[PDB]
Amino acid sequence: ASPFRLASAGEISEVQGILRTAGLLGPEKRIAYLGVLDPARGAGSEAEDRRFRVFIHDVSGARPQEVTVSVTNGTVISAVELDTAATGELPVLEEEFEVVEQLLATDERWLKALAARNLDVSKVRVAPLSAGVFEYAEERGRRILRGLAFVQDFPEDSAWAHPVDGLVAYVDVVSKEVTRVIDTGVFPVPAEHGNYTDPELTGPLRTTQKPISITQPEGPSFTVTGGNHIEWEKWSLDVGFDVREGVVLHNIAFRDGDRLRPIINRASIAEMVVPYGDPSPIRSWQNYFDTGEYLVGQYANSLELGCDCLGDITYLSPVISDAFGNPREIRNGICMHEEDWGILAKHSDLWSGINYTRRNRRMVISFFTTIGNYDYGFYWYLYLDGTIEFEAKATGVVFTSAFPEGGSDNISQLAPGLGAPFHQHIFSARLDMAIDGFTNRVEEEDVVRQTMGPGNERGNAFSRKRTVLTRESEAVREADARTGRTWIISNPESKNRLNEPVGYKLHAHNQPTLLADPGSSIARRAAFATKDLWVTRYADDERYPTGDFVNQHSGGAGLPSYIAQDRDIDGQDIVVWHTFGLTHFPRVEDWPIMPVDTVGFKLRPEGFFDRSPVLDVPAN
Amino acid sequence: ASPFRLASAGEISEVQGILRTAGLLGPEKRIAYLGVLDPARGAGSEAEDRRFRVFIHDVSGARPQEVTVSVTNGTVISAVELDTAATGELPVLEEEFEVVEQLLATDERWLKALAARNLDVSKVRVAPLSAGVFEYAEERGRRILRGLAFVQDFPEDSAWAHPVDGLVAYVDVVSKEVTRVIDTGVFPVPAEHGNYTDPELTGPLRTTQKPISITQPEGPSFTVTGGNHIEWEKWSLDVGFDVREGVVLHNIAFRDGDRLRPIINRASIAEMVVPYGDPSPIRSWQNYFDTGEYLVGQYANSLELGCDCLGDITYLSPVISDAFGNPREIRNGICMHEEDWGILAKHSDLWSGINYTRRNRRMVISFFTTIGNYDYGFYWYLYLDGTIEFEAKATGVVFTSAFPEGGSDNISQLAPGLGAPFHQHIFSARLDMAIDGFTNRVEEEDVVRQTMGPGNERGNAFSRKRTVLTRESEAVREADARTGRTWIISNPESKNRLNEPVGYKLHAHNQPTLLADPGSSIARRAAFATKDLWVTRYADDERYPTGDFVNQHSGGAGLPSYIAQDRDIDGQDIVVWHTFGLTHFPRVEDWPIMPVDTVGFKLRPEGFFDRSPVLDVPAN
Numbered sequence A, B: 001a002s003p004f005r006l007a008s009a010g011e012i013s014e015v016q017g018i019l020r021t022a023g024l025l026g027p028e029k030r031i032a033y034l035g036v037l038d039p040a041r042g043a044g045s046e047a048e049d050r051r052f053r054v055f056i057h058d059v060s061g062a063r064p065q066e067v068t069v070s071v072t073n074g075t076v077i078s079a080v081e082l083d084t085a086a087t088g089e090l091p092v093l094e095e096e097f098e099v100v101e102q103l104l105a106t107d108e109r110w111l112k113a114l115a116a117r118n119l120d121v122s123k124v125r126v127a128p129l130s131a132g133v134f135e136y137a138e139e140r141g142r143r144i145l146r147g148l149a150f151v152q153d154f155p156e157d158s159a160w161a162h163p164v165d166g167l168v169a170y171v172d173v174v175s176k177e178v179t180r181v182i183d184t185g186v187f188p189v190p191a192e193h194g195n196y197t198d199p200e201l202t203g204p205l206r207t208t209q210k211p212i213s214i215t216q217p218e219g220p221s222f223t224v225t226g227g228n229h230i231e232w233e234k235w236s237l238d239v240g241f242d243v244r245e246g247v248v249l250h251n252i253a254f255r256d257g258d259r260l261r262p263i264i265n266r267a268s269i270a271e272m273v274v275p276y277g278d279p280s281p282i283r284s285w286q287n288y289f290d291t292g293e294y295l296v297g298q299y300a301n302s303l304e305l306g307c308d309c310l311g312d313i314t315y316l317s318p319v320i321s322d323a324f325g326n327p328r329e330i331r332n333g334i335c336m337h338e339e340d341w342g343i344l345a346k347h348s349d350l351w352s353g354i355n356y357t358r359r360n361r362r363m364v365i366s367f368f369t370t371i372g373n374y375d376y377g378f379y380w381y382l383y384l385d386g387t388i389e390f391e392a393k394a395t396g397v398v399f400t401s402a403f404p405e406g407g408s409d410n411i412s413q414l415a416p417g418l419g420a421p422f423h424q425h426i427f428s429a430r431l432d433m434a435i436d437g438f439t440n441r442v443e444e445e446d447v448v449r450q451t452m453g454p455g456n457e458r459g460n461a462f463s464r465k466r467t468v469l470t471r472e473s474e475a476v477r478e479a480d481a482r483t484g485r486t487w488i489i490s491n492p493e494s495k496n497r498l499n500e501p502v503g504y505k506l507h508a509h510n511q512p513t514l515l516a517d518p519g520s521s522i523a524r525r526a527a528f529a530t531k532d533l534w535v536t537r538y539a540d541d542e543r544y545p546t547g548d549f550v551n552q553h554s555g556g557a558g559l560p561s562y563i564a565q566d567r568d569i570d571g572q573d574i575v576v577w578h579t580f581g582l583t584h585f586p587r588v589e590d591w592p593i594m595p596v597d598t599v600g601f602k603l604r605p606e607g608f609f610d611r612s613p614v615l616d617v618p619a620n
């Protein structure tokens, strides 16, 4: 019944039929993105209209199309031809992964490069990497992937241990031409394997770990209704899933007494970018937007009980479309469970004699995705006390190169002859805020140091200052860890019992933002990543910080174009965009498979409640 | 057998006998600190000499003494009279907590103040607060506590809800005189109660929480031998306990193959300070060093199975001395257990077809302490992958005041008429480093941004730079979150298989340091808290960042005096001192009992191992 329900296999089948009948799904068509559209602002009509957005690619070289379809009215709403030289290429297709290796395998320039290195072409894997936009005029308007080669010694070998450096090729995947092959020199292919399941490398496995059993004998404390609506410990929300963004959280609310109070209308990771800091011409073009270019949701793993998710697990199995419009289930793609989280509140009072201890817990909603060498877990946490937290968990295999004789300022050595270029992993969280309703504002809060003197005679005073962001042109903010800078999202029309505006405080990790030179191509295409915090006025079509078509777009789309409208954001329907990321100087311990590292952010209530919201928690 | 074993009740009894026989424990004596001394550098003699350090107070007004005693030779090693006007007062005694209220209860100035407010003296609780050093010349050389009053309406009432503002008294607890009573005006005593176990306030308790059962059917994976030696998942260490510092970790090492490799020789929280930022004369003197002035270990809680520590728990029950030299057990004062910690490493490889997932876990060693209104949990974590992490958990009841009519720049309103002054909680971790041995050095690592140009034609390069700290005068460092600043502790004489020095990287949270004016009394007494990182050359007597006698010391002792020696720290026996803390602007949700907030730091291996140290972990 809910307009926020997951897409069903039946809905996907109808979309395919509607497209087919209208002539838009010929044998040369490929669906490059399919996703349900959110209800527009003003759903108080209950006139449910399930609409879907589709990007249609053409393998014969015709112009792609963007198409909106109503499964509720069996109609094509709109269908527009796209000029990709203008607005960007469509996301990479999964079936294009192997096309790069196959086209290179018959190219004479490629075979001469491999032969000079004594490499058997049947052993050489080619990574299908997004191309970006650089100096090559012949690439404008064409669908280009770039290829870097790795050697597999045998079918189960980890190819990442054997990069073929000094060699890169560019490929046009529509016309099937190899446009350039660049060979800058021969590097020894690193010889050690990185097979982390080989007993030769692992040694004897440990026998010292004894099992930890986590069970819920009466089942979990949360309920799931309508397929994806969650209620847990006064929290209410809908769990959505989009093939581009992955897990999306809708309608986050908290039941404060008899009142259901909204907090966040929509929460997602709307983009992520991995820029590499190696100036070698072999890799200096390398940046991928896993979300915008590859679509992280379509590579979600099936999560195994006991290994990936431990405890009393409830699974969701989202449905997406394959390239031909058929539905495919991602079995067990989303794990949901509650976890004990230590002490929530504790006090032993000397004067009253009362000893008080309560335990905390959190609700976990998570998925894992794999794009090539990288694996990422996305975790949303809801805590008893009103805190919301996101955590990214980065693991998988680092992207490798040769380690140059005589070292490098931009590459780490992981093993003899084997290097790992410096890079970042940068995320954009899009938080469509709804603190007690849609009239919200953002204040920047800094600690204020005070000078010893009149009114502060012992020099101990300190304070804080809050600056309201009133227009989009002043809502592009940087972190300042030294002044304890945070941002408060408040509702000036909703007050707590002290007559102060209710609010939530955003706590950032204050990691470095984009390191690239501001005049670089990546700084223009990933402009969102140059600042920690952006606030925009809500608008239906402003979904991604990089725009709708990230692949090979020349830059500027998204956030910098949105905020130039300079709209009013002081007590309006606003969206907060938080940039956060990891700067990764690879270490020896990251090899041959990387232990998880983490980054994220959290939001805590700031005078949202009239007192602690966990006074009614019982004693275990 | 181990020289690092916990003190036994029998050892305490011998100390008391030795002191008594030597004439040092007369009926006017009080033991204000008793603790075992660490073995000196050069324990390779195995000549165990269990020595204890004792601070002896005299309630009749004689000079206190510092005494060292060998329980191994039944001898007083040394006994020195202390000039407290010079070197500071002894730590607050527990029996002095009630003396402040009792002395005030018969003072005419105090009774006139209470009578003007219609307060029954039998309802008025007085907090025994450390005095610091300010402008009062009469206080030099005397043992002073200051008193702030709270009203208890009935024996089980939370007094913190009813501060008596505009009133403070200073008391000499040795001569039992009230030296001053300051009344700056009448404030209404806030009327609402803060009784968080009152059904009137909590409402009906939740019935929606279902149990989480954590068990280990074959017992825990770690072993405890010799009372306090832990082995777990290649980690080895001794858990110590000191009445001042609390849990202390000794001899942290990791078994890498057949080799036991040291990492940290001694880890402790060596000081913590809570400065208040309210310039009102009633509170502008308020700073307490919970560790140095009050001794956090002697207020450790007895931790309850199921409430405080959940899972398969192993307890340690440390023994300390009471004020008369009798041993007292802190039953169940330290909890130890292992916890599941999610995914450790994961990759699904497109080319080899191998799907790989391993789970992480951590070893937890924790205690909780209560000093007045505040409750703090101290947690040490050891992870499978070599990471060491500390976390402080702050809860309890916020310190309160009246909320002034017309507001305040330095106080938060929590309830009608009830305020909570701004303050910080700042910790000092003392890490006596032993990375693969005692020859260590510290490098500061900053990210380096590079300009687009020759050698960096696409403007994507970035790098990092490391600066060796060679002398103590240059080893006082500040954080810089914007440049991703970290510190690496390495051993230049111990290399990994890549011929690079083995190391560990310290990751700070980069929270604000001490906010007080640098010319303030607190900035002089808590000088350590003004900078994020200090490195000193190890020396036996350099134990605390504030010196041995914090109470009423005039400032400068500790770290600023140590580093003026300007000793060589480049490949030497060094000690890292990390300042970290929380800046607390109290929120409504902190009232009437505060949900836990956290701060801490972590150390991760940086080329310490020759590859990931968790390749031998098995598949669940």
Ligand SMILES: [NH3+]CCc1ccccc1
Pocket (backbone or CB within 6 Å): A127, A128, A129, A130, A288, A290, A294, A371, A372, A373, A374
């Ligand atoms: N993460 C997207 C880049 C990528 C895609 C496929 C293989 C290796 C790398």
Ligand SMILES: [NH3+]CCc1ccccc1
Pocket (backbone or CB within 6 Å): B127, B128, B129, B130, B288, B290, B294, B371, B372, B373, B374
């Ligand atoms: N934390 C040390 C200060 C303190 C001590 C006792 C009661 C209230 C406050």
Ligand SMILES: [Cu+2]
Pocket (backbone or CB within 6 Å): A398, A423, A424, A425, A584
């Ligand atoms: Cu990385």
Ligand SMILES: [Cu+2]
Pocket (backbone or CB within 6 Å): B398, B423, B424, B425, B584
């Ligand atoms: Cu606090």
Ligand code: NA
Pocket (backbone or CB within 6 Å): A265, A432, A433, A434, A438, A538, A572, A573, A574, A575
């Ligand atoms: Na909004």
Ligand code: NA
Pocket (backbone or CB within 6 Å): B265, B432, B433, B434, B438, B538, B572, B573, B574, B575
């Ligand atoms: Na050392």
